[PDB]
Amino acid sequence: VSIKEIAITHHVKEGHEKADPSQFELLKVLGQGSFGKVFLVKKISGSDARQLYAMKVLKKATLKVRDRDILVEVNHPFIVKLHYAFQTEGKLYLILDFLRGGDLFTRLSKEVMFTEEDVKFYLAELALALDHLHSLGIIYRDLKPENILLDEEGHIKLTDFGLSKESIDHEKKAYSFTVEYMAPEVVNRRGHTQSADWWSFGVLMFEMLTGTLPFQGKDRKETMTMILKAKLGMPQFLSPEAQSLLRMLFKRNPANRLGAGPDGVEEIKRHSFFSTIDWNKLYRREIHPPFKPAT
């Protein structure tokens, strides 16, 4: 059951030059997260001079790993890559890939009308990224649409890789208190298991295909009650393959959930829903995304 906390203090490609605040120039604010604003920075020194990066500013960040650098191992085709990490004046600075494709939910909203096969492509790339973190013992924990971005080519890019973060004092909230994608065990505070991510995966699949969240409440308290006790009627516009995957994913006992069996993620890959996906070609980014961002 062993869990190890790795504090994120400094990072740079092995044999490369470590970065510091003077080497970046701020350009704009990319977006607003729970832990603060995300910035666009331009490297002004070194071999990657003129390159654009995304920057997060935190008090500290740790990576919880259960069961080569971990920051290098988490590198994946569909996960943001951390290029630099440095600490200054009691603040942690994360230099990340600048994701130029925008978020998936805005792209889907721009289309308005799309097919299940369109959403299938993004879910499949999302599934590979989640399993890669699972393979190294990392849990995504708090998977939400804000973390699901696209790159210039239109491929999925997760904005984080399971980091446990603490915001700076300026961003600090008075009450720490998102439950909509949380698994029942998480609501029960029974522990966050790797099957919890596949529950969050299912809620995203439901929301992307239906446009609505499966459990809707007025406040945090009510929605938590719905996650634990609600029985839902399957939307009938969904395909039989999609309904089957949702039913296998939406099981309140973690052990009954798809992906928690002995084969693990290949349970989900082999499902009837993802039948049209060539997973190896998908990993090689040789399958074109349904929508290109530049349009």
Added chain:
Amino acid sequence: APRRRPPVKFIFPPPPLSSLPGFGRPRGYAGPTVIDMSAPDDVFAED
């Protein structure tokens, strides 16, 4: 042709769940119908 799918639009930077209690949202699929609060292991009722 596959089964007719609903028009899907999202609000990015989703508004917080706590706020906006009675504000109506634009017309789309209302959501899954809650058949009961039986707390069954299988969230979806079998067809």
